[PDB]
Amino acid sequence: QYAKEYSEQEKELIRLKREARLKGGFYVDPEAKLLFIIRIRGINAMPPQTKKILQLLRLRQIFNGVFLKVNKATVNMLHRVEPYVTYGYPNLKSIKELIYKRGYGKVDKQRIALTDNAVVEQVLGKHGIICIEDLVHEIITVGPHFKEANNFLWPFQLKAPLGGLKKKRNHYVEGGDAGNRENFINELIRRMN
Amino acid sequence: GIDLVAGGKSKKTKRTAPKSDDVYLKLLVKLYRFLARRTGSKFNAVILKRLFMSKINKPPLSLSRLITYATGKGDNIVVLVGTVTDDVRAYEVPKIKVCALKFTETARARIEKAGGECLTFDQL
Amino acid sequence: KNDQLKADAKARGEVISTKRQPLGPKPGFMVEGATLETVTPIPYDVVNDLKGGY
Amino acid sequence: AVPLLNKKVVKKRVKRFIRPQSDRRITVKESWRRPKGIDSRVRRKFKGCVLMPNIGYGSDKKTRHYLPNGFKKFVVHNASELEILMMHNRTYCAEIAHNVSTRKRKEIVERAAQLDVVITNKLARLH
Amino acid sequence: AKKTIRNPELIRGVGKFSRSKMYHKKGLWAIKKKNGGKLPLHEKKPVKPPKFYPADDVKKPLVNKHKPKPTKLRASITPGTVLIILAGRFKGKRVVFLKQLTSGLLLVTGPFKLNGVPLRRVNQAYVIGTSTKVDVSGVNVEKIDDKYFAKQNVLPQEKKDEQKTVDSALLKAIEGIPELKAYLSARFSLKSGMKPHELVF
Amino acid sequence: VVRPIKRATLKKNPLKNLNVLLKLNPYAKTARRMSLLAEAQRVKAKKEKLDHAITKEEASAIKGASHSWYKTMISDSDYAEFDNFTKWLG
RNA sequence: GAUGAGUAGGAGGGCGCGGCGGUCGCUGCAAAACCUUGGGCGCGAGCCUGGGCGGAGCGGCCGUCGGUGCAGAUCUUGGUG
RNA sequence: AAUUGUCGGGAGGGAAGCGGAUGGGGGCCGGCGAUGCGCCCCGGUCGGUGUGGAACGGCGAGCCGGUCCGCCGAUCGACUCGGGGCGUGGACCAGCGUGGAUUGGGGGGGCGGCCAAAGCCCGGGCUCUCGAUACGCCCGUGGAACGCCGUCUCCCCGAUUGUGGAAGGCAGCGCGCGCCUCCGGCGUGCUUCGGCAUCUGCGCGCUCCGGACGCUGGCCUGUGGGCUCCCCAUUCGA
Ligand SMILES: [K+]
Ligand SMILES: [K+]
Ligand SMILES: [K+]
Ligand SMILES: [K+]
Ligand SMILES: [K+]
Ligand SMILES: [K+]
Ligand SMILES: [K+]
Ligand SMILES: [K+]
Ligand SMILES: [Mg+2]
Ligand SMILES: [Mg+2]
Ligand SMILES: [Mg+2]
Ligand SMILES: [Mg+2]
Ligand SMILES: [Mg+2]
Ligand SMILES: [Mg+2]
Ligand SMILES: [Mg+2]
Ligand SMILES: [Mg+2]
Ligand SMILES: [Mg+2]
Ligand SMILES: [Mg+2]
Ligand SMILES: [Mg+2]
Ligand SMILES: [Mg+2]
Ligand SMILES: [Mg+2]
Ligand SMILES: [Mg+2]
Ligand SMILES: [Mg+2]
Ligand SMILES: [Mg+2]
Ligand SMILES: [Mg+2]
Ligand SMILES: [Mg+2]
Ligand SMILES: [Mg+2]
Ligand SMILES: [Mg+2]
Ligand SMILES: [Mg+2]
Ligand SMILES: [Mg+2]
Ligand SMILES: [Mg+2]
Ligand SMILES: [Mg+2]
């Protein structure tokens, strides 16, 4: 069922954009509901405000990554640690690879590899999530139980990017690596996962 | 590097065992280590922890105060991780079943005279 | 308001949440086409580098 | 006797930890001492300096204290103490104490052969 | 019974047909009818005193489910292919590949008459397969196997005759191709400016 | 009253190990089979040179709308508000 | 399952020296000390052992005790460049 | 011990020493590295169910036992006992094979998005030139191939590595349990008509499946192997 839904949404967006084109208008795509945030600076010389915010985002180590729901409360927090992070909109492929390859569940405050669906059910079973595919669906669609499903995931321990970074000290708009890179976060996720 | 405090380790200290070398106390600790693990009873867990505690953390209980707290609870067994002392200010001692680490000589005599029983934690 | 909403939901056996939420992402929608005004950078003029000009 | 140990012994470091500047000064012995000086470059761990011993060098617990022959050493002072290793002859090897007479070493060596107990220094002071 | 596999594999471990399709092909529907509308249920398939007791309990290794597979044959190597030996006493000599033995080694012949290399086993990792092919249809080596090269010095006359019988059928094929006899009689070598990674074989 | 008497699994990459993936997502096998079969049909179809989903009138409207949209994309400003730079801007 | 910087400073677990109460031993078929390009163990304090010298004492373990651990003090005494 | 002589080894272009890594030359080490095991018969040696005694025991009067001695029956077994035959093989090092984990690199295929790419080619209409023989504009559900981005998927090569030693578990399949002409075909339900975890249970097996197994060679008192020891050299550090 989830696989069918993903394909339908992709084709649904294409149809709407074409429909607006035919009528001569514009179709504003829905704003991204999910973000993936990666820490690109180290833990040296941390101002107190940035240090606290990164802890609340569970980014305590460089190149650690986490998902984050989009709302004015979270976006404003993220705006205050802009030079220390890079983020964007993860596609379905990125979410699958992260959870399947580097997904670990927090069970009784312990980091447990998602080797079997029993691990997922042990914590998220009461919320209806019994398999890794259910966990993927909850994250991608930002379902009602996103908070529990996302918190259940231990922050992803990504590797140094294959191919390196351009300039961590400048914003992505200036040609650097910090800040919002929108759909280009996926390109970085491939090289870091 | 990892942004944690003391490498994420606990900085709290609690007693995981009695500081005493009393061989009998260690046998009681072994007995209640087994009971807490194999039963999951909250009572057993509390008893095990209090056996580790120091002297000042196991204050004595006077017989008079024991009688007041046992009023209307004759069927129940009184349990004290500590010493039970005698109180001359108490006149009437009802029959009561009391388990304690230690009973003073006068306290034991008064309880036994009144038809009560003094128990140890192995009998409990 | 929270009490009545829960009371109304209780009678119908539908568990809900009365919590507020911060502004979330907007949904997709279509905007009707209209005349487009072109914006371009303005050529520089030194005389205009002062309130009211020189 | 066939040693019971099967995991290979991995020594994280075979060189000893020599006290700093023991080469320079005769009175400064080689036995390790932690340098406490404020400016000590050894204490501050500047590269190209003497290394200090730390817990990271700890050997594998399964192969710790095992001799190259694959056994653990137990020092024996007479025949009676040798018999304690009868049921551990695949794990522990005996070593006769340095101060045992040659006459009493013959008894220990002969007894160890009957019990199949390995003796590390069985040729000591018999010539 | 069934003569061919019901479910061919698109890739290793994935069949061409789904479970629903296989149910029709397996005939479980037909079996259900013949057994009163129920799939038949079967049943599960139904010392000397020790002379010495060890003091330490014996430890047995855990089960490993991986089973070795037969050694693969390089695509460049086909029967009748000319191979170049890269190591050993016969390094550089060009031999004729006959077949691959059960052990995974390659059975090669000089032939002995041309270059003095007899029927020998050569590891595939120490040879290079060239593009030259010599017909070996008339060569019969069904009698040769791994045991033929097993130890138990004078070479018995029996093996010398066996070499000639196999060699004789191969000489005629070699003589057919011009300059092939001399090619097999000369060792391969690298000269100045010869780059192995650029050479075509 | 006692309750009845009571090792880490080497994590494997499901993106590479098929059996590991099927253990977590049994539907992955169906997706794999369909993709392989779908590709096989397309490869076969191209070799055989095997030969529309929109009405002819609809296709004409689509082309016109896209062409009109492209004209607006490349449209330029008249640069009339820059009266002092009319000659320079041409 | 997570995690590992550290002066001043605190604490824990250990190493070593000399007695005492016990216990288990060694020694003229060679104790202590000392010497060694012998060998080995411990992250380390240290420990075990081969050979030599020496010629009469010594050690392990439990507890307990102390005038109990040096590279420095223009340190003390002696000796020597 | 400082310090000194001598003999022997070695080094030295304005310090030496020291950390790390190898190498050369020394010195040292046989628990530095095995030679057994299983099954046969030849001989030798030493003991063997059922009833009698001796000294005891476990469980709690009574049941339930072993040890030692002797006597019958039974007729085998044991043997760091000696020979013969057959099978099997230890320590270390190296190569290869088949795979797991991690990882880098290379090659190909399918699909989707765009001005429902642009362009190019073909057909049609318009425009009619200075870098002179144009500049370009519009059309066609025309045609053959790209481009960028996204995604699905197949195959190949190398590198490092095997921690664990209780489980044939989990997961996905195959062959039987019904017939056919056997790359496939034959029955319900659903279907986008391609298909579908709708029927898909049991038994026995297989596999990318709860962490490496297999084969071969070399060598085993040697000019061999190993080394944390000694001297020295060299690159880096200091
Ligand atoms: K003593
Ligand atoms: K010594
Ligand atoms: K003492
Ligand atoms: K000298
Ligand atoms: K592609
Ligand atoms: K490998
Ligand atoms: K050897
Ligand atoms: K050097
Ligand atoms: Mg900085
Ligand atoms: Mg990390
Ligand atoms: Mg690179
Ligand atoms: Mg850079
Ligand atoms: Mg800065
Ligand atoms: Mg760390
Ligand atoms: Mg700290
Ligand atoms: Mg060491
Ligand atoms: Mg300082
Ligand atoms: Mg000595
Ligand atoms: Mg620290
Ligand atoms: Mg002492
Ligand atoms: Mg010396
Ligand atoms: Mg001592
Ligand atoms: Mg004193
Ligand atoms: Mg003092
Ligand atoms: Mg001094
Ligand atoms: Mg000092
Ligand atoms: Mg002085
Ligand atoms: Mg002086
Ligand atoms: Mg002088
Ligand atoms: Mg001297
Ligand atoms: Mg395309
Ligand atoms: Mg292992």
CSV table of N, CA, C and O in Angstrom, one decimal, chain E residues 26-103:
chain,number,residue,atom,x,y,z
E,26,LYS,N,1.9,-25.4,-8.6
E,26,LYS,CA,2.2,-26.5,-7.7
E,26,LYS,C,1.1,-27.5,-7.7
E,26,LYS,O,1.3,-28.6,-7.4
E,27,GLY,N,-0.1,-27.1,-8.1
E,27,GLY,CA,-1.3,-28.0,-8.1
E,27,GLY,C,-1.9,-28.2,-6.8
E,27,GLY,O,-2.6,-29.2,-6.6
E,28,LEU,N,-1.6,-27.4,-5.8
E,28,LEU,CA,-2.2,-27.6,-4.4
E,28,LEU,C,-3.7,-27.6,-4.5
E,28,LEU,O,-4.3,-28.3,-3.7
E,29,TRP,N,-4.3,-26.8,-5.4
E,29,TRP,CA,-5.7,-26.9,-5.6
E,29,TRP,C,-6.2,-28.3,-6.0
E,29,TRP,O,-7.2,-28.8,-5.5
E,30,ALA,N,-5.5,-28.9,-6.9
E,30,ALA,CA,-5.8,-30.3,-7.3
E,30,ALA,C,-5.6,-31.3,-6.2
E,30,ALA,O,-6.4,-32.2,-6.0
E,31,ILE,N,-4.5,-31.1,-5.4
E,31,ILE,CA,-4.3,-32.0,-4.3
E,31,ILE,C,-5.3,-31.8,-3.2
E,31,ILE,O,-5.7,-32.8,-2.6
E,32,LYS,N,-5.8,-30.6,-3.1
E,32,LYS,CA,-6.9,-30.4,-2.0
E,32,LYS,C,-8.1,-31.2,-2.4
E,32,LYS,O,-8.8,-31.8,-1.5
E,33,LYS,N,-8.5,-31.2,-3.6
E,33,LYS,CA,-9.7,-31.9,-4.0
E,33,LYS,C,-9.6,-33.4,-3.8
E,33,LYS,O,-10.5,-34.1,-3.3
E,34,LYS,N,-8.4,-34.0,-4.1
E,34,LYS,CA,-8.2,-35.4,-4.0
E,34,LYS,C,-8.2,-35.9,-2.6
E,34,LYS,O,-8.3,-37.1,-2.3
E,35,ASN,N,-8.0,-35.0,-1.6
E,35,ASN,CA,-7.9,-35.4,-0.2
E,35,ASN,C,-9.0,-34.7,0.6
E,35,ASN,O,-8.9,-34.2,1.7
E,36,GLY,N,-10.2,-34.8,0.0
E,36,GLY,CA,-11.4,-34.3,0.8
E,36,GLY,C,-11.3,-32.8,1.1
E,36,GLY,O,-11.7,-32.4,2.2
E,37,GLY,N,-10.9,-32.0,0.1
E,37,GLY,CA,-10.8,-30.6,0.4
E,37,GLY,C,-9.9,-30.2,1.5
E,37,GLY,O,-10.2,-29.2,2.2
E,38,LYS,N,-8.8,-30.9,1.7
E,38,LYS,CA,-7.8,-30.6,2.7
E,38,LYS,C,-6.5,-31.0,2.3
E,38,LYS,O,-6.3,-32.1,1.6
E,39,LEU,N,-5.5,-30.2,2.6
E,39,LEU,CA,-4.1,-30.6,2.2
E,39,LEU,C,-3.6,-31.7,3.2
E,39,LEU,O,-3.6,-31.5,4.4
E,40,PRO,N,-3.1,-32.8,2.6
E,40,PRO,CA,-2.7,-33.9,3.5
E,40,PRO,C,-1.6,-33.4,4.5
E,40,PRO,O,-0.7,-32.7,4.1
E,41,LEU,N,-1.6,-34.0,5.7
E,41,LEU,CA,-0.6,-33.7,6.7
E,41,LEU,C,0.2,-34.9,7.0
E,41,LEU,O,-0.4,-36.0,7.3
E,42,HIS,N,1.5,-34.8,6.9
E,42,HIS,CA,2.4,-35.9,7.2
E,42,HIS,C,3.0,-35.8,8.6
E,42,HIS,O,2.6,-34.9,9.4
E,43,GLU,N,3.9,-36.7,8.9
E,43,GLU,CA,4.5,-36.8,10.2
E,43,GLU,C,6.0,-36.6,10.1
E,43,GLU,O,6.6,-37.0,9.1
E,44,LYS,N,6.6,-36.0,11.2
E,44,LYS,CA,8.0,-35.8,11.2
E,44,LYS,C,8.8,-37.1,11.1
E,44,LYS,O,8.4,-38.1,11.6
E,45,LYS,N,9.9,-37.1,10.3
E,45,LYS,CA,10.7,-38.3,10.1
E,45,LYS,C,11.1,-38.8,11.5
E,45,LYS,O,11.9,-38.2,12.2
E,46,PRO,N,10.6,-40.0,11.9
E,46,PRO,CA,11.0,-40.6,13.2
E,46,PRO,C,12.4,-41.2,13.2
E,46,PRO,O,13.2,-40.8,12.3
E,47,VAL,N,28.6,-44.3,23.0
E,47,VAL,CA,28.0,-45.5,23.5
E,47,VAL,C,29.0,-46.2,24.4
E,47,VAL,O,28.7,-46.5,25.6
E,48,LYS,N,30.1,-46.5,23.8
E,48,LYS,CA,31.2,-47.2,24.6
E,48,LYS,C,31.6,-46.3,25.7
E,48,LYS,O,31.8,-45.1,25.5
E,49,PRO,N,31.8,-46.9,26.9
E,49,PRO,CA,32.2,-46.0,28.1
E,49,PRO,C,33.5,-45.4,27.8
E,49,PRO,O,34.5,-46.0,27.2
E,50,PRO,N,33.7,-44.1,28.2
E,50,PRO,CA,35.0,-43.4,27.9
E,50,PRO,C,36.1,-44.0,28.7
E,50,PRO,O,35.9,-44.5,29.8
E,51,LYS,N,37.3,-44.0,28.1
E,51,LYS,CA,38.5,-44.5,28.8
E,51,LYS,C,39.2,-43.3,29.5
E,51,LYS,O,40.2,-43.6,30.2
E,52,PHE,N,38.8,-42.1,29.4
E,52,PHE,CA,39.4,-40.9,30.0
E,52,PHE,C,38.4,-39.8,30.0
E,52,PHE,O,37.8,-39.5,29.0
E,53,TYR,N,38.3,-39.1,31.2
E,53,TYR,CA,37.4,-38.0,31.3
E,53,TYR,C,38.2,-36.7,31.4
E,53,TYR,O,39.0,-36.6,32.3
E,54,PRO,N,38.0,-35.8,30.4
E,54,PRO,CA,38.8,-34.6,30.5
E,54,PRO,C,38.4,-33.7,31.7
E,54,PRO,O,37.2,-33.7,32.1
E,55,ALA,N,39.3,-33.0,32.2
E,55,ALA,CA,39.1,-32.1,33.3
E,55,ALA,C,38.4,-30.8,32.9
E,55,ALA,O,37.6,-30.2,33.6
E,56,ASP,N,38.7,-30.4,31.6
E,56,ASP,CA,38.1,-29.1,31.1
E,56,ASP,C,37.0,-29.5,30.0
E,56,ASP,O,37.3,-30.3,29.1
E,57,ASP,N,35.9,-28.9,30.2
E,57,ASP,CA,34.8,-29.2,29.2
E,57,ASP,C,35.2,-28.9,27.8
E,57,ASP,O,35.7,-27.8,27.6
E,58,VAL,N,35.0,-29.8,26.9
E,58,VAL,CA,35.3,-29.5,25.5
E,58,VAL,C,34.4,-28.5,24.9
E,58,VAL,O,33.2,-28.5,25.2
E,59,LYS,N,34.9,-27.6,24.0
E,59,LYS,CA,34.1,-26.6,23.3
E,59,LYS,C,34.0,-27.0,21.8
E,59,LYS,O,35.1,-27.2,21.2
E,60,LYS,N,32.8,-27.0,21.3
E,60,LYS,CA,32.6,-27.3,19.9
E,60,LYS,C,32.3,-26.0,19.1
E,60,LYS,O,31.4,-25.3,19.6
E,61,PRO,N,32.8,-25.8,18.0
E,61,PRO,CA,32.6,-24.6,17.2
E,61,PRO,C,31.1,-24.5,16.8
E,61,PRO,O,30.4,-25.5,16.6
E,62,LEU,N,30.6,-23.2,16.7
E,62,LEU,CA,29.3,-23.0,16.3
E,62,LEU,C,29.1,-23.4,14.8
E,62,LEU,O,30.1,-23.5,14.1
E,63,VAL,N,27.8,-23.6,14.4
E,63,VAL,CA,27.5,-24.0,13.1
E,63,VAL,C,27.7,-22.9,12.1
E,63,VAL,O,27.3,-21.8,12.4
E,64,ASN,N,28.4,-23.2,11.0
E,64,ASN,CA,28.6,-22.2,9.9
E,64,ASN,C,27.8,-22.7,8.7
E,64,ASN,O,28.0,-23.9,8.3
E,65,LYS,N,26.9,-21.9,8.2
E,65,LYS,CA,25.9,-22.3,7.1
E,65,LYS,C,26.5,-22.1,5.8
E,65,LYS,O,25.9,-22.4,4.8
E,66,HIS,N,27.7,-21.5,5.6
E,66,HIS,CA,28.3,-21.2,4.4
E,66,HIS,C,29.1,-22.5,3.9
E,66,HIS,O,29.9,-23.0,4.6
E,67,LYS,N,28.8,-22.9,2.7
E,67,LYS,CA,29.4,-24.1,2.1
E,67,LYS,C,30.3,-23.7,0.9
E,67,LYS,O,29.8,-22.9,0.1
E,68,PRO,N,31.5,-24.2,0.8
E,68,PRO,CA,32.3,-23.8,-0.3
E,68,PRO,C,31.7,-24.2,-1.7
E,68,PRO,O,31.1,-25.2,-1.8
E,69,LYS,N,31.9,-23.4,-2.7
E,69,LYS,CA,31.5,-23.6,-4.0
E,69,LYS,C,32.6,-24.0,-4.9
E,69,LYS,O,33.8,-23.7,-4.7
E,70,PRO,N,32.4,-24.7,-6.0
E,70,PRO,CA,33.5,-25.1,-6.9
E,70,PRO,C,34.2,-23.9,-7.5
E,70,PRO,O,33.6,-22.8,-7.8
E,71,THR,N,35.5,-24.0,-7.7
E,71,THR,CA,36.3,-22.9,-8.3
E,71,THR,C,35.8,-22.6,-9.7
E,71,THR,O,35.5,-23.5,-10.5
E,72,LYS,N,35.6,-21.3,-9.9
E,72,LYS,CA,35.1,-20.8,-11.2
E,72,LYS,C,36.2,-20.8,-12.2
E,72,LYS,O,37.4,-20.7,-11.9
E,73,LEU,N,35.8,-20.9,-13.5
E,73,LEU,CA,36.7,-20.9,-14.6
E,73,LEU,C,36.7,-19.6,-15.3
E,73,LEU,O,35.6,-19.2,-15.7
E,74,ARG,N,37.8,-19.0,-15.5
E,74,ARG,CA,37.9,-17.7,-16.2
E,74,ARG,C,37.3,-17.8,-17.6
E,74,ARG,O,37.6,-18.7,-18.3
E,75,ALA,N,36.5,-16.8,-18.0
E,75,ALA,CA,35.9,-16.8,-19.3
E,75,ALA,C,36.9,-16.8,-20.4
E,75,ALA,O,36.6,-17.4,-21.5
E,76,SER,N,38.1,-16.2,-20.2
E,76,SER,CA,39.1,-16.2,-21.3
E,76,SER,C,39.6,-17.6,-21.5
E,76,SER,O,40.2,-17.9,-22.6
E,77,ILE,N,39.5,-18.6,-20.6
E,77,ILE,CA,40.1,-19.9,-20.7
E,77,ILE,C,39.0,-20.8,-21.2
E,77,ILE,O,38.0,-21.0,-20.5
E,78,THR,N,39.2,-21.4,-22.3
E,78,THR,CA,38.3,-22.4,-23.0
E,78,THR,C,39.1,-23.6,-23.4
E,78,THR,O,40.3,-23.4,-23.7
E,79,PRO,N,38.6,-24.7,-23.6
E,79,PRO,CA,39.3,-25.9,-24.0
E,79,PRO,C,40.1,-25.6,-25.3
E,79,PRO,O,39.5,-25.1,-26.3
E,80,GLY,N,41.3,-26.0,-25.4
E,80,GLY,CA,42.2,-25.7,-26.5
E,80,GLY,C,42.8,-24.4,-26.5
E,80,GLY,O,43.6,-24.0,-27.4
E,81,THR,N,42.6,-23.6,-25.5
E,81,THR,CA,43.2,-22.2,-25.4
E,81,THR,C,44.7,-22.4,-25.0
E,81,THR,O,45.1,-23.2,-24.2
E,82,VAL,N,45.5,-21.5,-25.6
E,82,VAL,CA,46.9,-21.4,-25.3
E,82,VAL,C,47.1,-20.6,-24.0
E,82,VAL,O,46.7,-19.4,-24.0
E,83,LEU,N,47.8,-21.1,-23.0
E,83,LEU,CA,48.0,-20.4,-21.8
E,83,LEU,C,49.5,-20.1,-21.6
E,83,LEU,O,50.4,-20.9,-22.1
E,84,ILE,N,49.8,-19.0,-20.9
E,84,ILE,CA,51.2,-18.6,-20.6
E,84,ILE,C,51.4,-18.8,-19.1
E,84,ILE,O,50.6,-18.3,-18.3
E,85,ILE,N,52.3,-19.6,-18.7
E,85,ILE,CA,52.6,-19.9,-17.3
E,85,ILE,C,53.5,-18.7,-16.8
E,85,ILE,O,54.5,-18.3,-17.4
E,86,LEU,N,53.1,-18.2,-15.6
E,86,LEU,CA,53.7,-17.0,-15.0
E,86,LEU,C,54.6,-17.3,-13.9
E,86,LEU,O,55.3,-16.4,-13.4
E,87,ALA,N,54.6,-18.6,-13.3
E,87,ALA,CA,55.4,-18.9,-12.2
E,87,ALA,C,55.9,-20.3,-12.2
E,87,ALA,O,55.3,-21.1,-13.0
E,88,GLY,N,56.9,-20.7,-11.4
E,88,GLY,CA,57.4,-22.0,-11.4
E,88,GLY,C,58.5,-22.2,-12.4
E,88,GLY,O,59.0,-21.3,-13.1
E,89,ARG,N,59.0,-23.5,-12.5
E,89,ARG,CA,60.1,-23.8,-13.4
E,89,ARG,C,59.7,-23.6,-14.8
E,89,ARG,O,60.6,-23.4,-15.7
E,90,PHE,N,58.4,-23.7,-15.2
E,90,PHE,CA,57.9,-23.5,-16.5
E,90,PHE,C,57.4,-22.1,-16.8
E,90,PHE,O,56.6,-21.9,-17.7
E,91,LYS,N,57.9,-21.2,-16.0
E,91,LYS,CA,57.5,-19.8,-16.2
E,91,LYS,C,57.8,-19.3,-17.6
E,91,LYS,O,58.9,-19.5,-18.1
E,92,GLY,N,56.8,-18.7,-18.3
E,92,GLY,CA,57.0,-18.2,-19.6
E,92,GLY,C,56.6,-19.1,-20.8
E,92,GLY,O,56.4,-18.6,-21.9
E,93,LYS,N,56.6,-20.4,-20.5
E,93,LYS,CA,56.3,-21.4,-21.5
E,93,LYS,C,54.8,-21.3,-21.9
E,93,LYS,O,53.9,-21.0,-21.1
E,94,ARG,N,54.5,-21.5,-23.2
E,94,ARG,CA,53.1,-21.5,-23.7
E,94,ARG,C,52.7,-23.0,-23.8
E,94,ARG,O,53.3,-23.8,-24.5
E,95,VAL,N,51.5,-23.3,-23.1
E,95,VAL,CA,51.0,-24.6,-23.1
E,95,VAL,C,49.5,-24.6,-23.6
E,95,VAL,O,49.0,-23.5,-23.9
E,96,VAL,N,49.0,-25.8,-23.8
E,96,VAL,CA,47.6,-25.9,-24.3
E,96,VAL,C,46.7,-26.3,-23.2
E,96,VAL,O,47.0,-27.3,-22.5
E,97,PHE,N,45.6,-25.6,-23.0
E,97,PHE,CA,44.6,-26.0,-22.0
E,97,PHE,C,43.7,-27.1,-22.5
E,97,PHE,O,43.1,-27.0,-23.5
E,98,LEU,N,43.6,-28.1,-21.7
E,98,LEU,CA,42.8,-29.3,-22.0
E,98,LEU,C,41.4,-29.3,-21.3
E,98,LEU,O,40.4,-29.3,-21.9
E,99,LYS,N,41.4,-29.2,-19.9
E,99,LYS,CA,40.2,-29.2,-19.2
E,99,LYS,C,40.5,-28.7,-17.8
E,99,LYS,O,41.7,-28.6,-17.4
E,100,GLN,N,39.5,-28.5,-17.0
E,100,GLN,CA,39.6,-28.2,-15.6
E,100,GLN,C,39.2,-29.4,-14.7
E,100,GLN,O,38.2,-30.0,-14.9
E,101,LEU,N,40.1,-29.7,-13.8
E,101,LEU,CA,39.9,-30.8,-12.9
E,101,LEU,C,38.8,-30.5,-11.8
E,101,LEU,O,38.4,-29.4,-11.7
E,102,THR,N,38.5,-31.6,-11.1
E,102,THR,CA,37.5,-31.4,-10.0
E,102,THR,C,38.0,-30.5,-8.9
E,102,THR,O,37.2,-29.7,-8.3
E,103,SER,N,39.3,-30.5,-8.7
E,103,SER,CA,39.9,-29.6,-7.7
E,103,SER,C,39.9,-28.1,-8.0
E,103,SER,O,40.2,-27.3,-7.2
